[PDB]
Paper text:
Lon is involved in cellular protein homeostasis by degrading damaged or misfolded abnormal proteins, which prevents these unwanted protein species from forming toxic aggregates. Lon is known to form a homohexamer; each protomer is composed of multiple domains, including an N-terminal substrate-binding globular domain (NGD), a long-helix domain (LH), a three-helix bundle (3H), a AAA+ ATPase module, and a protease domain. We show here, using cryo-electron microscopy (cryo-EM), that the activation process of the Lon AAA+ protease may involve a pentameric assembly and a substrate-dependent incorporation of the sixth protomer to form the substrate-pore-loop contacts seen in the translocating state.
To create monomeric mutants, we designed ΔN-E613K and ΔN-L708R mutations, each of which would introduce a positive charge to the hydrophobic interface. If the ΔN-E613K and ΔN-L708R proteins are monomeric, they are expected to bind next to Ob5 and Ob1, respectively, of the open-spiral pentamer to form inactive hexamers. We solved the cryo-EM structure of ΔN-E613K in complex with MtaLon-Y224S. This heteromeric hexamer distinguishes from the native spiral hexameric form, where the protomer Ac6* binds next to Ob1. The heterocomplex also adopts an auto-inhibited spiral structure; however, unlike the native spiral hexamer, the 3H subdomain of Ob1 rather than Ac6* occupies the axial cavity of the spiral complex. Altogether, these results demonstrate the binding of a monomeric mutant to the pentameric Lon, which results in a 5+1 heteromeric complex. The heteromeric complexes containing the incorporated monomeric ΔN-E613K or ΔN-L708R are expected to be non-functional as they are unable to form a closed-ring structure due to the mutated residues at the binding interface.
Author numbering:
A (entry chain E): 2 to 73
B (entry chain E): 147 to 291
C (entry chain A), D (entry chain B), G (entry chain D): 219 to 291
E (entry chain B), H (entry chain D): 365 to 436
F (entry chain C): 219 to 509
I (entry chain B): 510 to 582
Amino acid sequence: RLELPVIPLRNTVILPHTTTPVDVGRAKSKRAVEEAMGADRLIFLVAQRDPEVDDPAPDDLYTWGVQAVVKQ
Amino acid sequence: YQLEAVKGTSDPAMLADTIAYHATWTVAEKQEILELTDLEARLKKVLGLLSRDLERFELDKRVAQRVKEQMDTNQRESYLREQMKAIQKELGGEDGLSDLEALRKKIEEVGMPEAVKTKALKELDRLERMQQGSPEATVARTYLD
Amino acid sequence: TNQRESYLREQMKAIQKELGGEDGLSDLEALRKKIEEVGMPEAVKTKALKELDRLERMQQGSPEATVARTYLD
Amino acid sequence: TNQRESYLREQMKAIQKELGGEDGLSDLEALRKKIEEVGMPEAVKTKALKELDRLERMQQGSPEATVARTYLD
Amino acid sequence: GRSIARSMNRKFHRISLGGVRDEAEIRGHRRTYIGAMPGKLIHAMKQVGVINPVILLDEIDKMSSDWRGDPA
Amino acid sequence: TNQRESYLREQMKAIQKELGGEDGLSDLEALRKKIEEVGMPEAVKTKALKELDRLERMQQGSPEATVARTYLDWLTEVPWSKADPEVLDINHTRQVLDEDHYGLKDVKERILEYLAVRQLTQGLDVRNKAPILVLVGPPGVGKTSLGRSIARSMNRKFHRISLGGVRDEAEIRGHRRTYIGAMPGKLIHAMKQVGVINPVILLDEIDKMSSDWRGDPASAMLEVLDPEQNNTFTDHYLDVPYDLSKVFFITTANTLQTIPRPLLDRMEVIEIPGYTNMEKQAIARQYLWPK
Amino acid sequence: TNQRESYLREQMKAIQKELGGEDGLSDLEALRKKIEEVGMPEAVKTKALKELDRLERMQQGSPEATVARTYLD
Amino acid sequence: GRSIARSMNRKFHRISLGGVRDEAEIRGHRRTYIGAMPGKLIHAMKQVGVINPVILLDEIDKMSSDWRGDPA
Amino acid sequence: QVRESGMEGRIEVTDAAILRVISEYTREAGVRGLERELGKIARKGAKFWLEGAWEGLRTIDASDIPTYLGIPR
Ligand SMILES: Nc1ncnc2c1ncn2[C@@H]1O[C@H](COP(=O)(O)OP(=O)(O)O)[C@@H](O)[C@H]1O
């Protein structure tokens, strides 16, 4: 929802109620990963577009963002 | 595991979203799926894309079997045809070279210049084609006529 | 390489001649679909194919050969 | 019909990739690109698919491939 | 005409259509050799590259018209 | 037997590709090398990338690789970022036209005015948006040796390209590098003849170009005459323009009238007569008889 | 290195035996020895060497070599 | 020219240049495949066996100058 | 013609000189001949400044007209 970090999903949105892996290699989204443990394991997983830069701009994000309770 | 991951579903969103993620189509079509905020509209759209990709599968599958059946019929047609070209390796090519032998005997009874004998041998390299009774071999048999 | 080349040469037979994509090499198909479309009397068809034979015994390099092309059209 | 014709386009590019093995994408596939995404009516579009199919014969020893290329231009 | 173009803020063009005698170079010439070419109208149309340009045509009073089609 | 003969045949055609086909790939690799040594601009590097996708041919008869590498030969051979340190002295030209020709002292000063506005350009780049020179006279006048005079007078290089016999625009706008015979007009052949990017290039007998061909090579000249478009000039064979603002073109004719209308623009007229019999003696005794 | 180029040449020639026509192709090898032994200038010789190794094509099936005979002779 | 060949002690090979139209034969023809024939000149200076023959260029006023390349 | 001349700020033709250039050189109802007049003025003045200014403001009055151009036509 609000004040939750955003992980740009790599070229594929995470459809709900699905056991999916979310991989973060860039340090700029690793900052949102480290903030995500401060968000009670509830990440506002807003996916970016098909092209994604190393420093992910929020303008490249989609208008639909999924929220996931982190299993591990 | 995509098939057993979508079995045992209570919620409609437990089924349809899991299936549409585990299915195989484009990522820009995800936006029209979610922008259709009614779950009936999402379910009908995902069903339509599933049917579209399934029909593409039957299309590619029937042309793959068309490729393998034309492979089979060209293989066996060529197999009977190489029984024919094996007789032409054995009996028919000997008869063509017997025509060339008769005209080469006429070469040694009138007497070519040896460069013309060499050219008879050269288009006999264009001839002496045991692999197939080529139209080039027919026209070089006319040449040696 | 030759195995996959044979597979794609079989696939192009399988997918375009069967379905309604294209009629193969459409330079000759254009050169004959310009004949088929019009419905002239067949004497003019024989004249068109005569000019076609004239433009097939040469590779369209004469100055009159392009006049023959555009006149065939 | 559209999901058939998409696959028909996918295999329609396959003959020009065989041409692009020797005579590469440099200008020829660029003309294939100017066939579609440059906006034209469907009569032009079908004529341009026909005109790609007028090509892909052979290019070493013919300006007829070049003249099909330039009318395709 | 250039002033009219920039007043209209659509692109100026000019082609010396003076002395042009040939519809086989204005409606062009159907080709089997390297070198037949479409109209200077067609060429100017490319040179603006826009369906609504401001194209001056030059000196049409002296329109020679003998052979290769009348472009009139 | 078929298995054995196919197995051996493929190996011997493979070695034939090592023998006949591989030399073509190696020579085209060497032409890629001369791209990397010649110092192309990055747009001309993009044309060299088009070359990299064009050098993949067994060349026999109208071959794409041979006329493509011919375009590469032209493009490397039209020079790149050479300086030609042109002496910015009108007086140097003033002494050159005297030392190499007698002259009427009635036509040299128009050349000097032209080179003056070359020396007083609004751009720091030397520009030619003013009308360009045209010479009209007898053929026997030393127009080409005046080209040599303005070569050495401006430290440039003069290259005898007699354009006056050239007729077809297919010669001028050389066509695509898909067929051998896509050969440019004599400007790229003289720009071959220079290894500095700003030479003396002469344009010859535009009255004597009568349009005996489809297409207008006078229009192609107007594409290289207007300095707002010689720098954007391509033919078919060029795709990134060789900029010809540096590549100065002097036009020169003999008859006043049969120059085409699309080339009467941007002209400044210079009319030279013959020589008086005393001046004929002078040119003979100090030049022609010593020659 | 030179004896390696030689041995690959008589395996090239050894496979010219048993294949195609040794008559004609041995004419091409003696021909190309005549081609080498007339005294070429070095640019002439080097740009003849590619044409020489292209004349190594078998004359009938690769008829480029056939006109290469009438070129390098 | 035969007397010149006696005098200069050189070989010659005369050749005929009347009514010849194509640089398939005026110049060599492009070797597209088998049977590309380059014409009279290369055979003519193939018949000589020296790099210094005298070459008899004959009836040159009888040209027919046209396409497939030019005699001049 | 002065921006085209590239000797700006230094050439200053008086208007009476301009009227005299109209009155002496060119008789066209167009203007391009007068532009060529002023171009010749600019060319000869560029030659004159090229060795140095006698004035940093070339007052081109009715006097110096055949000094930057040919005698009144
Ligand atoms: N004042 C002069 N006018 C013309 N030519 C001169 C003069 N002084 C010397 N010459 C020499 O006379 C020759 C003229 O003959 P030519 O070279 O045929 O002229 P072009 O080839 O330039 O038409 C020139 O090469 C030039 O070097």
